[PDB]
Design a protein around this motif. Structure first.
Motif, PDB file in Angstrom:
ATOM      1  N   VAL A 100       0.034 -37.018  30.462  1.00 49.19           N
ATOM      2  CA  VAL A 100       0.445 -37.935  29.404  1.00 49.19           C
ATOM      3  C   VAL A 100       0.666 -39.289  30.069  1.00 49.19           C
ATOM      4  N   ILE A 101      -0.209 -40.242  29.768  1.00 49.40           N
ATOM      5  CA  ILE A 101      -0.162 -41.584  30.346  1.00 49.40           C
ATOM      6  C   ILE A 101       0.499 -42.502  29.323  1.00 49.40           C
ATOM      7  N   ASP A 102       1.756 -42.881  29.579  1.00 49.49           N
ATOM      8  CA  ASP A 102       2.571 -43.513  28.540  1.00 49.49           C
ATOM      9  C   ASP A 102       3.869 -44.125  29.084  1.00 49.49           C
ATOM     10  N   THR A 103       4.953 -44.067  28.298  1.00 53.15           N
ATOM     11  CA  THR A 103       6.264 -44.555  28.720  1.00 53.15           C
ATOM     12  C   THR A 103       7.017 -43.554  29.583  1.00 53.15           C
ATOM     13  N   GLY A 104       6.411 -42.412  29.903  1.00 49.81           N
ATOM     14  CA  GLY A 104       7.066 -41.350  30.644  1.00 49.81           C
ATOM     15  C   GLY A 104       7.276 -40.124  29.770  1.00 49.81           C
ATOM     16  N   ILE A 105       7.899 -39.109  30.373  1.00 47.23           N
ATOM     17  CA  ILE A 105       8.335 -37.904  29.664  1.00 47.23           C
ATOM     18  C   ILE A 105       9.734 -37.530  30.117  1.00 47.23           C
ATOM     19  N   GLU A 106      10.631 -37.295  29.160  1.00 50.88           N
ATOM     20  CA  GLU A 106      11.936 -36.714  29.480  1.00 50.88           C
ATOM     21  C   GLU A 106      11.701 -35.263  29.873  1.00 50.88           C
ATOM     22  N   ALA A 107      11.361 -35.077  31.155  1.00 52.74           N
ATOM     23  CA  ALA A 107      11.023 -33.743  31.641  1.00 52.74           C
ATOM     24  C   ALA A 107      12.184 -32.773  31.482  1.00 52.74           C
ATOM     25  N   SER A 108      13.411 -33.288  31.345  1.00 52.68           N
ATOM     26  CA  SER A 108      14.602 -32.458  31.198  1.00 52.68           C
ATOM     27  C   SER A 108      14.751 -31.872  29.804  1.00 52.68           C
ATOM     28  N   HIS A 109      13.945 -32.311  28.847  1.00 52.47           N
ATOM     29  CA  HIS A 109      14.128 -31.860  27.484  1.00 52.47           C
ATOM     30  C   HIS A 109      13.836 -30.370  27.423  1.00 52.47           C
ATOM     31  N   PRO A 110      14.766 -29.551  26.913  1.00 48.34           N
ATOM     32  CA  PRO A 110      14.569 -28.090  26.887  1.00 48.34           C
ATOM     33  C   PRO A 110      13.275 -27.654  26.220  1.00 48.34           C
ATOM     34  N   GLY A 166      10.940 -43.093  24.369  1.00 53.43           N
ATOM     35  CA  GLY A 166      10.745 -41.951  23.526  1.00 53.43           C
ATOM     36  C   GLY A 166       9.296 -41.732  23.146  1.00 53.43           C
ATOM     37  N   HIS A 167       8.498 -42.803  23.132  1.00 52.80           N
ATOM     38  CA  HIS A 167       7.099 -42.691  22.742  1.00 52.80           C
ATOM     39  C   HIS A 167       6.362 -41.658  23.590  1.00 52.80           C
ATOM     40  N   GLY A 176      -6.993 -36.504  14.158  1.00 53.21           N
ATOM     41  CA  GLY A 176      -5.918 -35.565  14.342  1.00 53.21           C
ATOM     42  C   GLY A 176      -4.734 -35.930  13.479  1.00 53.21           C
ATOM     43  N   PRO A 177      -3.863 -34.959  13.217  1.00 50.96           N
ATOM     44  CA  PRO A 177      -2.605 -35.265  12.525  1.00 50.96           C
ATOM     45  C   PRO A 177      -1.902 -36.447  13.183  1.00 50.96           C
ATOM     46  N   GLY A 178      -1.451 -37.396  12.358  1.00 47.56           N
ATOM     47  CA  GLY A 178      -0.943 -38.665  12.850  1.00 47.56           C
ATOM     48  C   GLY A 178       0.161 -39.355  12.057  1.00 47.56           C
ATOM     49  N   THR A 179       0.416 -38.960  10.804  1.00 49.29           N
ATOM     50  CA  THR A 179       1.448 -39.586   9.980  1.00 49.29           C
ATOM     51  C   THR A 179       2.602 -38.615   9.818  1.00 49.29           C
ATOM     52  N   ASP A 180       3.808 -39.069  10.170  1.00 50.78           N
ATOM     53  CA  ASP A 180       5.021 -38.247  10.108  1.00 50.78           C
ATOM     54  C   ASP A 180       4.880 -36.997  10.981  1.00 50.78           C
ATOM     55  N   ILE A 181       4.917 -37.238  12.290  1.00 52.19           N
ATOM     56  CA  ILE A 181       4.689 -36.208  13.297  1.00 52.19           C
ATOM     57  C   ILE A 181       6.022 -35.928  13.979  1.00 52.19           C
ATOM     58  N   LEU A 182       6.574 -34.753  13.742  1.00 53.45           N
ATOM     59  CA  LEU A 182       7.856 -34.419  14.335  1.00 53.45           C
ATOM     60  C   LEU A 182       7.624 -33.976  15.777  1.00 53.45           C
ATOM     61  N   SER A 183       8.412 -34.510  16.709  1.00 47.37           N
ATOM     62  CA  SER A 183       8.223 -34.138  18.106  1.00 47.37           C
ATOM     63  C   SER A 183       9.428 -34.576  18.941  1.00 47.37           C
ATOM     64  N   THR A 184       9.415 -34.152  20.205  1.00 46.94           N
ATOM     65  CA  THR A 184      10.520 -34.400  21.116  1.00 46.94           C
ATOM     66  C   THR A 184      10.819 -35.890  21.197  1.00 46.94           C
ATOM     67  N   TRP A 185      12.081 -36.211  21.471  1.00 44.33           N
ATOM     68  CA  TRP A 185      12.479 -37.591  21.703  1.00 44.33           C
ATOM     69  C   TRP A 185      13.476 -37.648  22.858  1.00 44.33           C
ATOM     70  N   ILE A 186      13.598 -38.837  23.456  1.00 40.67           N
ATOM     71  CA  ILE A 186      14.524 -38.994  24.560  1.00 40.67           C
ATOM     72  C   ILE A 186      15.948 -38.678  24.103  1.00 40.67           C
ATOM     73  N   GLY A 218       1.392 -42.560  13.975  1.00 43.30           N
ATOM     74  CA  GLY A 218       0.440 -43.420  14.655  1.00 43.30           C
ATOM     75  C   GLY A 218      -0.724 -42.632  15.209  1.00 43.30           C
ATOM     76  N   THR A 219      -1.807 -43.360  15.533  1.00 43.40           N
ATOM     77  CA  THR A 219      -2.860 -42.706  16.309  1.00 43.40           C
ATOM     78  C   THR A 219      -2.347 -42.265  17.679  1.00 43.40           C
ATOM     79  N   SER A 220      -1.189 -42.769  18.099  1.00 41.47           N
ATOM     80  CA  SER A 220      -0.543 -42.249  19.295  1.00 41.47           C
ATOM     81  C   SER A 220      -0.083 -40.807  19.128  1.00 41.47           C
ATOM     82  N   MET A 221       0.100 -40.347  17.891  1.00 36.72           N
ATOM     83  CA  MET A 221       0.508 -38.985  17.594  1.00 36.72           C
ATOM     84  C   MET A 221      -0.672 -38.060  17.380  1.00 36.72           C
ATOM     85  N   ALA A 222      -1.801 -38.604  16.916  1.00 34.82           N
ATOM     86  CA  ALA A 222      -3.013 -37.815  16.762  1.00 34.82           C
ATOM     87  C   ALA A 222      -3.616 -37.462  18.115  1.00 34.82           C
TER      88      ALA A 222
END
Length: 279
Positions: free
Chosen positions: A37-47, A68-69, A203-213, A222-226
């Motif tokens: 995942v090439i981005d703002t990072g990943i909260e690798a600690s997220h359960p 969070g992105h 890909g699915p892209g509008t109202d995408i539930l997912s992990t956050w910081i 966004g197309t960032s979610m697709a």
């Protein structure tokens, strides 16, 4: 396997009809594969990541996800509740600062980093890179995504959120990589999603539930979610032997739900990522 009450996007990629609530997938779940995942990072600690995520590179004072992105996207690739490939390994390359901005030169560096760093990692089922990022046309950026692709990695990139032709965006406009438009839960093209002949898949892209910081979760669009959906799918299909890094985008387009999307402009493909899993 079945994930009951899965996020709509997960359910969508496992289904032929919108509106369903369960995500169907082979239990291999991308075991043995690797998605950068090439981005703002990943909260690798997220359960939600289960110790399967780990940051491997940053170009900033911290490798933490202050945004969070990136965490949102890696959650859609591989998190237990929110991801497509639930047993995959997630590598964080932080090319975006905590405002979601990054310089092209840094993005390029991050791409070149991934082409090499996959050789430090055990990914016997292959390697995926996810690029929920872009901006104006740059051929340097396109070349970089092409090299990453050619180097043996499956590159899925966002088409862009401009509701314009992705021709004028990068790395979205690079032919040799998988360029991903966004749709909503009703199989409409997302209002913002870029379009054009350079798209390969939606890909699915509008109202995408997912992990956050902060160990939280949230729904964004966004197309960032697709992109990470198709990234996760790629890795899922490579673990299953069904495709290779070099062939995956074409495979996903071959095996995608065809013609099921609305407001697709003439010239833009009407293909919706689809895992074709049969229990």
């Amino acid at each position: 396997a079945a994930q009951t009450n899965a996020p709509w996007g997960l359910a969508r990629i496992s289904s032929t009809s919108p509106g369903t609530s369960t995500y169907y997938y082979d239990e291999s779940a991308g075991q043995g594969s690797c998605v950068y995942v090439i981005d703002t990072g990943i909260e690798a600690s997220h359960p939600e990541f289960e110790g399967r995520a780990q940051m491997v590179k940053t170009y900033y004072y911290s490798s933490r996800d202050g945004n969070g992105h990136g965490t949102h996207c890696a959650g859609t690739v591989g998190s237990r509740t929110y991801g497509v490939a639930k047993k995959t390994q997630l590598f964080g390359v932080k090319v975006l600062d905590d405002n979601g901005s990054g310089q092209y030169s840094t993005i390029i560096a991050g791409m070149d980093f991934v082409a090499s760093d996959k050789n430090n990692r055990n990914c016997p089922k292959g390697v995926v890179a996810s690029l929920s990022l872009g901006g104006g046309y740059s051929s340097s950026v396109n070349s970089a995504a092409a090299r990453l692709q050619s180097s043996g990695v499956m590159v899925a990139v966002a088409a862009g959120n401009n509701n314009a032709d992705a021709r004028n965006y990068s790395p979205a406009s690079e032919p040799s990589v998988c360029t991903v438009g966004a749709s909503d839960r009703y199989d409409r093209r997302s209002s913002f999603s870029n379009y054009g002949s350079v798209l390969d898949i939606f890909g699915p892209g509008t109202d995408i539930l997912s992990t956050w910081i902060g160990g939280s979760t949230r729904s964004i669009s966004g197309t960032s979610m697709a992109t990470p959906h198709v990234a996760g799918l790629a890795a899922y299909l490579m673990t299953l032997g069904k495709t290779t890094a070099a062939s995956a985008c074409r495979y996903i387009a071959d095996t995608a739900n065809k013609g099921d999307l609305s407001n697709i402009p003439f010239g833009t493909v009407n293909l919706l990522a689809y895992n074709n899993y049969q229990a």
